[PDB]
Amino acid sequence: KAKYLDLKNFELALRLRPFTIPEEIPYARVDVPRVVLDRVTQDSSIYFWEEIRFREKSGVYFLYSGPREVFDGYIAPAMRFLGDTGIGGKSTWGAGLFEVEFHEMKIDAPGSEYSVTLSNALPTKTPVLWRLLRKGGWSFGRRKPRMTFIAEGSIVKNDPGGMERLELGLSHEVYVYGLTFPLGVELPEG
Amino acid sequence: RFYGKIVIKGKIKAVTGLHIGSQRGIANPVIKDPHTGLPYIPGSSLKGRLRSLFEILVNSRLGEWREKYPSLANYSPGSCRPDNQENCGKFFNRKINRGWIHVCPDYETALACPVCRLFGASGKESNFPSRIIVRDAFLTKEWEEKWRAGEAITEAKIEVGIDRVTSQANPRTNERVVAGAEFEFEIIYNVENTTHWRDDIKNLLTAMALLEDSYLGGSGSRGYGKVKFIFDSFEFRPLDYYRTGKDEDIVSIDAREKSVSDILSGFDSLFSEVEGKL
Amino acid sequence: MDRRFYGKIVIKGKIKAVTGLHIGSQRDISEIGGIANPVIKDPHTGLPYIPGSSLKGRLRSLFEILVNSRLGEWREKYPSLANYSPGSCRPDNQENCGKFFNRKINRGWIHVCPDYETALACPVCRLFGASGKESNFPSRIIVRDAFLTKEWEEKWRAGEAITEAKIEVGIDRVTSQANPRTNERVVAGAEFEFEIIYNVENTTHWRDDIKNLLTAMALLEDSYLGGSGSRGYGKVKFIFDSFEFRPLDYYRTGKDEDIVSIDAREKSVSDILSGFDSLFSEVEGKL
Amino acid sequence: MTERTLKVLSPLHIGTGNELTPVDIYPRENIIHVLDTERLVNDLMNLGELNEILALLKNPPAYIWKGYIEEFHLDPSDYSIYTLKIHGRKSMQIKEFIKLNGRPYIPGSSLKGAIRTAVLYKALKECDARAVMRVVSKVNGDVARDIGRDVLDYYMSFLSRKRADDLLEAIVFGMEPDRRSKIRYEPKRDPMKALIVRDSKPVGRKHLAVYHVEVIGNPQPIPIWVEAIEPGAATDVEIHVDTEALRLNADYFNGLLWECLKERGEPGEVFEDFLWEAVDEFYTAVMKYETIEVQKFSQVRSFYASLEDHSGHVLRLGWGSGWLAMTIGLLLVEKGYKWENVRKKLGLGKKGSGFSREFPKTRRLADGMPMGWVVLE
Amino acid sequence: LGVMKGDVDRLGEFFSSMDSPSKLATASRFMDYFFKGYIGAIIEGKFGYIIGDVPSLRDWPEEPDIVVVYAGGDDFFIVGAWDQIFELAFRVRRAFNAYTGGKLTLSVGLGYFDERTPIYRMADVVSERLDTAKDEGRNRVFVVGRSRPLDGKHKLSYEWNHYEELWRTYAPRIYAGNGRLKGKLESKKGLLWKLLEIRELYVRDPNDVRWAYLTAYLLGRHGLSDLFPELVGIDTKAVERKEPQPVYWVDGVLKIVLMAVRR
Amino acid sequence: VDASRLFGESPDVVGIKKMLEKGKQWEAIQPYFDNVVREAKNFLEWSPNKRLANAVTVAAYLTSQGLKTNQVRKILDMARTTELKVKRGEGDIKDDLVKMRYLLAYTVGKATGQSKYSLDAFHRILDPMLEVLMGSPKKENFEKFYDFLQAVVAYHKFFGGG
RNA sequence: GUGGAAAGGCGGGCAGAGGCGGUUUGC
RNA sequence: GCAAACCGCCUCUGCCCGC
Ligand SMILES: [Zn+2]
Ligand SMILES: [Zn+2]
């Protein structure tokens, strides 16, 4: 039933070692109620709204492999723009805002023929052991079509992934990210 | 197109007990962070109260503002409540569930309305996003330490209802924040167009100046609001800040100024470099 | 239908407790040894105060009874009072009928009009506001909480008693046996800085809503505030500092363009008194 | 009327449940003085300790514990009252008067509780043939009040902290619906919730003095020291009835007092006139009753014969008003044996029971003046 | 709106014990019949000798307002009135205790929701309140959402015999049946809401002993020294055995009664 | 019997309230625990439940006497105001602890009659802690005083006095 | 080239009604 | 020669309506 693992217990599950699940998830899914008040008569109309509320030290992070000239040219100036606008959700109510720090992670992974995906997959060939994720977002008010991704941690073999460009009636072409983030993994017989 | 982000930091002072309910051991609880148990002011209770005060401000001045803001010429002062027809001639034109709000119906009209240009519009084939971001105000470090020192941060107040003839008392309780608290707010305006941002800052300060004489949430008419904006700093965050990352933003200095010593007392003075760099 | 905004008539001043005031709370808030029946207190500063709920409701209580005395004399000047007859819905447990006290809150009947446009022509429910199903007219006055004034802050620092304990004993007439209790009260002569903000919505009827708020104020200096006022504890006296107007051009500019009426030495029965039109004549010159 | 001023004809002590210990007092002269311990103790440190916390807790041979400040210091007093009598050998506990800032006033809860005794006396005089129709509505116990036969002749045998007046206040002021007993009091049903009396203006320091109250009725009289307002002080008090609060409650009041107002005319109109006719009929009747007993002191009767030909409304207040003036039992003298078994049921004498002097034995009079007379007008 | 969601615990180990296809075909019909046919006759008020005394707010109606959304063979998701979803979870548990030989258990999550809540959210909450009761002991009920410190020594869910014994002590002294309190506690909810605020001082710091005498003063001045004679004195054996104080488990009995009352 | 009931930390909160509703058993075993309270001269002698243990033994021995709370309210409200000063208002109670010692000394200088012993035992306990509080800080070591003095009054209502 | 865009948990509700710091008698 | 006894709270109310 466990969804996540530590940085240390991940390196054990890549080697088919005994591992332990974490005791605590760093966030909650609360349902804050809002209201829509009439402007003349102050009449109320409750709707419900769900969120992700982190703890005192907790947060969220992603990983980047790539050349450093692409990082500090593109990924690093973009993440400071996004510190003052949102990542999804009601950014006008102060949701997707954050402060960005840069560090270094090192993962011990066994060299193999297979690999796990640390991002959405959108595979070319059929993968080994997977888990379907089905979502399609929004782009300038245009509703993206739903695309069968693969959830994270699923197992592929020699797959690069690949982005699908879409039309959506805009001026510019919309690319949808489906590249995989391969880390080596050890498997049983299927 | 993006030019920069005018950033407004300061403090919210609850001069009187502030109550923003949740309706879920006190019988009417103010909302709270689920991990700390501390109260906070949302960014959505602050924004809809800055907007509800400003929409009634525009509603009185539809005729006088037909030639500074277009698409106030398509609205008549009043609500569309009796004749149940949305986007009609009157002002409060969109019914959500049972409440009527001014939301302009198209992108081509929300770029002219002073409410929807600053606060946003939904529309059909429109989706005008807002230009301000209102963060959730949390207690100041000095008031999180009083939570560590064992004090009470939210009192519980008992009212009563009394018959006009026989004086039968009928009480209830309302949790509300202890008066005197200091929150920390944040409003990040998004400089899309470089021409009409002065009218979008001066309208946002007008919504705050009406909020210092109205209330914030709760009972209010029985004295549960009485808020006070205490500004700290305004920063510009230019477009050159985000590309190269070097710290050359333009910072205004206002440690102890009001919301009315800031609107015109220093408006030509405090925004002198921001109006120069544009 | 058609809510507008022209400004905020602000009524400041002070409340003089000529006889000692007692706005009671409940205890048990991590408090152990104290006078029974305590005055309510600001939990941060420690001092007593007067809630806006205790003052907006007490002015509503005295003015609703003033209108119930005359349901044949105000109806020539206000519509929708012809819907109501003098009485209460206590002899017939039905909410909205011809009786003037119509809302059972929990058990107590209080004149609140059930609709917007019925309450828009009511002299009570346009000044104090109303709740309803589908109408919900909101109020036009807000009454804030009144803490001690800045000089009575300093008397607390100097060690002077800001409260006291009065012991009242109830005696059975037949056996002459006392049943003693101690009631905390604010010391007589104390002074609280108050705040009433009227919200000017319709410029046709705003004379009346100030002439009715100043009517209920003059009824409150004749009546009592809080406490057990039939045994002494009331006797509020309103000491005005300054009426101000706050026009719509104030909140947009920021310049001090408010029309400041001066009654710094006048009385609540002297503002309603000849001179009402002498003091608010520059408000009418601005509207 | 508003601001109906009063005057004071005898010593008048409104207690606060507090006495002055002899460490608070040092009488240098026939005048006395109230020393300020908080300021004097904190003012006697500059010359120096733990000796003050030891000596005040010890309470030795008072005189020396207040005259030890005379060594290298003097002049630390608060109010400095006058003794006005041949006493004070300190050995006394002066009971103090109620004061709001060290200034004596008359509390309005104490002048209302004297009018309530006068009004209760008038209701039991005029209201047994009409007292059944009051409890005919939602009480069902008036048949016991009819078969006994003027509900007083039942209440002497009905009884046969102390809740003795519980039924009698529930008949004259407030009939409830039901209880574990027959009926009970309801504060929401009361004409006296329309009677508004307020605290008077403060009297003054010049009219306050200590007294020496001697108790007479035994061969060995006892003195009690107390402070009281001297006779001749006049302050102003405002009493008014809110007639608007009676018009709203014309159907909700259920009591014998309400059935005394519907017979003088409009019951929300004559209640203020009924109010003072109840005052000058309880307190003049207790004024005449004390001319029978001559056990006091002579000069006491020369005070009572002079209380007549005095304009205004005369009533008791305070602490020296005896059992005869705080209580219905002036009306319960004419029963005799119907109240004689019940007065021993309630109990009286202690340290068994007083046989022939059960209720009226004690008289507390200050300097040969029967204390506690205040005349409104 | 009250929602329960339950399932049989360690059931895969039970069916793995069957060694022959006729033995599997018996154990899989009898378990199927409890959640298909006999869960109907529990709601029908039958089997009173077998069920007995369960924590009931109101007495059992002739027609319960219960809508069985699903009941599969181990799993059941039942919605209804929140007072009768509460009682039925103890009434399903006792009958399942005796339909078996006392060998198989249940685990029930319980939620109390607004009417106008999306149903995919009422499932995702009670599925978490079921799994919180499931990774702790697998014979225990989640009753009401509850505050507790993050020290790992306190668990939100009650065991079945623990809560059903906490109800036979604390409910017949404060609760009379059918939404009314007892004598000497009518118009005294202000005792009970502040009693939960004293319980919040245990939540903020369990090592602080300030809750012990504030209980004694608040029960004292109301004259109720007879009610709750163990919330005044700290249990030293519970600190010895490293189990929570009795002020911690009283929340699941009070807060149900405070919800039962108009509040 | 009473000494075995009066155990170390919370020996019998439910048990002593029944026995205090007695004469010879509590005149000795609580006298040893009153002497145990006086032998703990330092106010910071109990970081554990022993403040909650002393105050139960104090308020059981005082409930055997009278101990009207009304007589003590001048001290009890004075302890409330001095704790209110600690909230960033003042930091020196030494100018007013002497007043609170004097109000404690004035109270026993007044309390005469059958209620001498109800104030003599009350005089015996707080003053060795007020000796320590003279030369002490007021945010700390007075925090432990005022919480001890609450638990004395709090259990005194539970045992049935006031 | 963001499962997005718009959306105040609030409208109305006196902690209030009743209540002499008192009386008794001795050690 | 001056007091010492008892009484220190009692009894009614406690979230509605509206999405
Ligand atoms: Zn618009
Ligand atoms: Zn109305």
Cα–Cα distances (Å) from E103 to B90, D302, D309, E9, E136, in that order, read 70, 99, 99, 10, 18
Resolution in A: 3.1
Q: By what technique were these coordinates determined? A: cryo-EM
- C1'-nearest nucleotide to the CA of B97: H19
**Chains with at least 3 CB pairs less than 8 angstroms from chain B:** A, C, D, E
Q: Residue ranges of the alpha helices (H) in E18-139? A: 21-34, 40-43, 48-51, 82-99, 119-134
Closest by CA position to B42, among listed A95, A36, A99, E114? A95
Across A29-42, b (16+ Cβ under 10 Å) vs e yields: eeeebeebbbbbbb
**C136 and A42 in contact by Cβ < 8 A?**
yes
Q: Which two tokens stand for residue E33?
A: 């019949």
What's the N-to-C CA distance of chain A in angstroms? 21
Whether residue C69 contacts residue D245, with contact meaning beta carbons closer than 8 Å, is answered with no
Q: Using CA atoms, how far apart are residues D254 and C188, in angstroms rounded to an integer?
A: 36
Distance CA F20, CA F61 (A): 9
Distance CA A109, CA A127 (A): 20
Residue F7 lies in a domain: no
Q: Please say whether the beta carbons of F11 and F5 come within 8 A.
A: yes
Strand (E) or helix (H) holding B198: helix B198-211
Tokens of D82: 């006058």
Residues, chain C = 287
> If 0-12 CB within 10 Å is exposed, 13-18 middle and 19+ buried, where does residue F22 land?
exposed
CB proximity A97 to B under 8 Å: yes
User: Residue type for C176, please?
Assistant: S
Strand partners, C38: none
Residues 135-174 of B with CB under 7 A from strand G: 158-162, 167-169, 171-172
Neighbouring CB atoms inside 10 A of C219's CB total 18
Q: B120-128: long-range contacts (C-beta < 8 A, 24 or more apart)?
A: B120/A92, B122/B94, B125/A141, B126/A141, B127/A140, B127/A141, B128/B104
Number of other residues whose CB lies within 10 A of the CB of residue B194: 10
Structure tokens at E208: 């602080």
β-strands E76-80, E66-71: how paired? antiparallel
Tell me if chain C has a CB within 8 Å of the CB of B70: no
If you search the block for the tokens 């992700």, which residue do you land on? Answer: A52
Q: How far is residue C104 from each of residues B163, C68, C90, C107, E187, measured CA to CA in Å?
A: 9, 17, 9, 5, 19
Rounded (to 5) percent helix, strand, coil in chain F: 65, 0, 35
d(CA B272, CA B267): 8
Inter-chain residue contact C3 with A38, CB threshold 8 Å? no
Helix axes F50-64, F117-132, angle to 10 degrees: 150
Which amino acid appears at position B37 of this protein?
A: G
In a domain, F158, yes or no: yes
Binding site members of B for Zn(2+): 102, 104, 113, 116
Q: How far is the CA of B170 from the centre of ligand 2 (A)?
A: 20
Asked if residues A145 and A164 have their Cβ atoms less than 8 Å apart, the reply is: no
**Has residue F128 been placed in a domain?**
yes
Burial class (CB in 10 A: 0-12, 13-18, 19+), C104: middle
- Assess whether A47 (CB) lies less than 7 A from strand G: yes
Tell me the three state secondary structure of residue C127. Answer: coil
The tokens for B107 are 């992108």
Amino acid identity for residue E262 in this structure: R
> Taking Cα atoms as reference points, which of D205, D234, D245 lies closest to residue D377?
D234
Distance in angstroms (rounded) separating the CA atoms of residues C227 and C248:
40
CB distance C12 to C242 below 8 Å: yes
Residue C159's Cβ-count burial label (10 Å; 0-12, 13-18, 19+) is exposed
Contacts of E21 by beta carbon, 8 Å cutoff, 6+ apart? none
Single-letter residue type at C194: F
Residue C182 is inside which H or E element, if any?
strand C178-186
Amino acid letter at E174? I
- The letter for the amino acid at B56 is I
Q: Quick check: A47 and B44 in contact, CB under 8 A? A: no
Distance C200 CA to ligand 2 centre (A): 18
The Cα A54–Cα A60 span in angstroms is 9
For residue B58, which amino acid is it?
Answer: V
Q: Is residue F99 situated within a structural domain? A: yes
Distance from the alpha carbon of residue B233 to the mean position of ligand 2, in angstroms: 47
What is the C-alpha separation between A147 and A166, in angstroms, rounded?
11
**How do beta strands C85-88 and C99-101 pair?**
parallel
CA–chain centroid gap for D226, Å, is 15
Contact residues, chain E, for B25 at CB < 8 Å: 193-194, 196-197, 199-200, 255, 258
Cβ atoms C34, F77 nearer than 8 A: yes
Let me know the angle formed at the C-alpha of E9 by E4 and E11, rounded to the nearest 5 degrees: 125
Contact list, A48 vs chain E (CB under 8 Å): 116-118, 121
Stretch (H or E) spanning A50? strand A46-50
Task: Give the CA-trace dihedral at C17, C23, C29, C32, to 10 degrees.
Answer: 70
Query: Is the distance from CB of D202 to CB of C189 less than 8 angstroms?
Result: no
DSSP A91: G
Whether nucleic acid strand G comes within 7 Å of the CB of D361, the answer is yes
Contact A45 B7 (CB under 8 A): no
Task: Please count the structural domains in chain C.
Answer: 1
Subunit partners of chain E (3 or more CB pairs within 8 A): A, B, C, F
Chain B residue numbers touching A141 (CB-CB < 8 A): 125-127
**Nearest residue on chain F to E214, judged by CA atoms?**
F154
Residues of F in contact with C182 (CB under 8 A): 70
Q: Quick count: other Cβ atoms within 10 Å of Cβ C175?
A: 21
Q: Which of C174, C183, C228 would you mutate first to test chain D, the one with the most D CBs within 10 A?
A: C174
- Cα dihedral D345, D349, D353, D355 sign: negative
Extended beta strands in chain B, E state: 4-14, 40-41, 76-79, 90-92, 94-95, 100-101, 132-134, 137-139, 154-159, 172-177, 182-191, 227-235, 251-253
Give the closest ligand to the alpha carbon of residue B110: 1
CA dihedral over D130, D136, D139, D144, signed as positive or negative: positive
SS3 call for C78? coil
**How many CB atoms lie under 10 A from the CB of residue D115?**
21
- Those residues with Cβ within 8 angstroms of residue F80's Cβ, 6 or more apart along the chain or in another chain: C31, C33, C34
Residue C22 marked ligand-binding: no
Cβ-contact C148, C192 below 8 angstroms: yes
Nucleotide in closest CA–C1' contact with E116: H19
List of chain F residues whose C-beta atoms are within 8 Å of the C-beta of residue D57: 105, 108-109, 123
Residues 6+ apart with CB under 8 A from B36: A56, B147
Residue in this structure with the two tokens 């902290």, named with its chain if needed = D161
CA distance A150 to A145: 16
For the record, the structure tokens of B238 come out as: 């230019």
Q: Is the CB of B168 under 7 A from strand H?
A: yes
**Which one, of B152, F59, F56, lies nearest residue E232 by Cα?**
F56
- The whole-angstrom separation of Cα B92 and Cα B97 is 13
**CB atoms near residue D217 (< 10 Å):** 14
The CA–CA distances, whole Å, from A167 to A78, A135, A141, B48, B128 equal: 24, 17, 13, 36, 21
Domain housing F39: 22-162
Residue E116 — φ and ψ, nearest 5°? Answer: -85, 50
Rounded CA-CA distance D125/D259 in Å is 12
B235 three-state secondary structure: strand
Q: Phi/psi of residue F89, each to 5°?
A: -95, -55
Q: CA nearest D62 in F: which residue?
A: F109
> Measured between alpha carbons, how far is B67 from B21 in angstroms, rounded to an integer?
41
What CA–CA distance (Å, rounded) separates A120 from A127? 13
Angle at which helices E189-204 and E210-221 cross, to 10°: 170
Q: B247 pairs with which residues across the strands? A: none
* CA gap D136, D133 in Å, rounded: 5
Interface-testing mutation among B26, B98, B153, with chain E (most E C-beta atoms within 10 A): B26
Residue F118 in contact with residue F62, Cβ under 8 Å?
yes
Decide: helix, strand or coil at residue A40: coil
- DSSP annotation string for C206-238: SHHHHHHHHHHHHHHTTS--SS-TTBT---EEE
Does F65 reside within a domain?
A: yes
Instruction: Kindly determine whether residue D164 and residue C234, on different chains, have CB atoms separated by under 8 Å.
Output: no
Q: What angle do CA E90, E96, E98 make, to 5 degrees?
A: 110
Cα C162–chain centre separation: 23
Give the three-class secondary structure for B241.
Answer: helix
Find, among C201, B209, C205, B63, the residue nearest to A40 by Cα. C201
Is the minimum distance from the CB of D354 to strand G below 7 Å?
yes
Dist. CA B26–CA B156, nearest whole Å: 7
Q: How far apart are alpha carbons A78 and A70 in whole angstroms?
A: 11
Helix (H, G, I), strand (E, B) or coil at C109: strand
**Of C159, C168, C144, whose CA–CA distance to C20 is shortest?**
C168
Q: Is the CB of B131 under 7 A from strand G?
A: no
Q: Which domain holds residue B37?
A: 1-278
Nearest residue to B148 (alpha-carbon basis) of B33, B265, B36:
B36
Residue in chain D closest to C181 (alpha carbons) equals D17
DSSP for B110-140, please give it.
Answer: HTT-HHHHHH-B-TTTT-B--SEEEPPEEE-
With beta carbons under 8 A apart, name residues in chain B contacting D193: 167
Q: Which of C33, C35, C182 lies nearest to residue F153, judging by beta carbons?
A: C33
**Ligand 1 center from residue F91 Cα (angstroms):** 56
A121 contacts A130 by C-beta, under 8 angstroms: yes
In a 3-state reduction of DSSP, which class is residue F126? helix
Q: Which of residues 30-49 of C touch strand H (CB under 7 A)?
A: 36-37
Protein-proximal nucleotides of chain H (any atom < 7 Å from a CB): 1-19
Instruction: Tell me: is residue C122 an annotated ligand-binding position.
Output: yes
| Nucleic strand H under 7 Å from the C-beta of E183 | no
CB C117 within 8 A of CB B82: no
Cβ neighbors of E46 (< 8 A, separation 6 or more) are none
Q: What is the dihedral of CA D162, D167, D168, D170, to 10 degrees?
A: 120
Q: Are D234 and D8 in contact (CB under 8 A)?
A: yes
Burial of F65 (0-12, 13-18, 19+ CB in 10 A): middle
Query: Which helix (DSSP H) or strand (DSSP E) does residue F99 occupy?
Result: helix F94-108
Q: How many angstroms separate the alpha carbon of residue B103 from the centre of ligand 1?
A: 5
Q: Give the Å distance between the CA of D55 and the centre of ligand 2.
A: 68
Decide if F13 is inside a domain: no
Based on C-alpha coordinates, what's the Rg of chain A?
Answer: 20
What is the spatial distance between Cα A167 and Cα A140, in angstroms, rounded to a whole number?
12
Q: Which of E225, E226, E230, E237 to mutate to test the interface with F (most CBs of F within 10 A)?
A: E225
- d(C-alpha D111, C-alpha C232), whole Å: 10
From the Cβ of C131, is strand H under 7 Å away? yes
B contact test, residue of A32, A92, A101 with most B CBs within 10 A: A92
| Sequence-distant (≥ 6) Cβ neighbours of residue E196 within 8 angstroms | B25, E251, E254, E255, E258
Q: What are the φ and ψ backbone dihedral angles of B191, each rounded to 5 degrees?
A: -80, 90
Chain E residues closer than 8 Å to B27 by CB: 193, 263
**How far is the CA of E4 from the CAs of A28, A50, E178, E230, in angstroms?**
21, 22, 22, 32
Q: What is the 3-state secondary structure (H, E, C) of chain D?
A: CCCEEEEECCCECCEEEEEECCCCECCCCCECCECCHHHHHHHCCCCCCCHHHHHHHHCCCCCHHHHCCCCCCCCCCCCCCECCCCCCCCCCCEEEECECCCCECCCHHHHHHHHHHHHHHHHHHHCCCCHHHHCCCCCCCHHHHHHHCCCHHHHHHHCCCCCCCHHHHHHHCCCCCCCCCCCCCCCCCCHHHCEEECCCCCCCHHHEEEEEEEEECCCCCEEEEEEEECCCCCCEECEEECCHHHHCCCCCCCCCCHHHHCCCCCCCCCHHHHHHHHHHHHHHHHHHHCCCCCCCCCCHHHHHHHHCCCCCEEEECCCCCCCCCCCHHHCCCCCCHHHHHHHHHHCCCCCCCCCCCCCCCCEEEECCEECCEEEEC
In the block, tokens 């703890």 appear at A55
The radius of gyration of chain C from alpha carbons, rounded to an integer in Å, stands at 21
CB atoms B167 and D188 under 8 Å = yes
Q: CB within 8 A of D149, min separation 6: which ones?
A: D128
Determine the protein residue whose CA lies at the shortest distance from the C1' of H12. Answer: D186
Nearest CA-CA partner of D37 in D53, D61, D18 = D53
Residue B97 CA to ligand 1 center (angstroms) comes to 19
Separation in Å, CA of C33 to nearest CA in chain F: 6
Nearest of D375, D332, D377, D325 to residue D118 by alpha carbon: D325
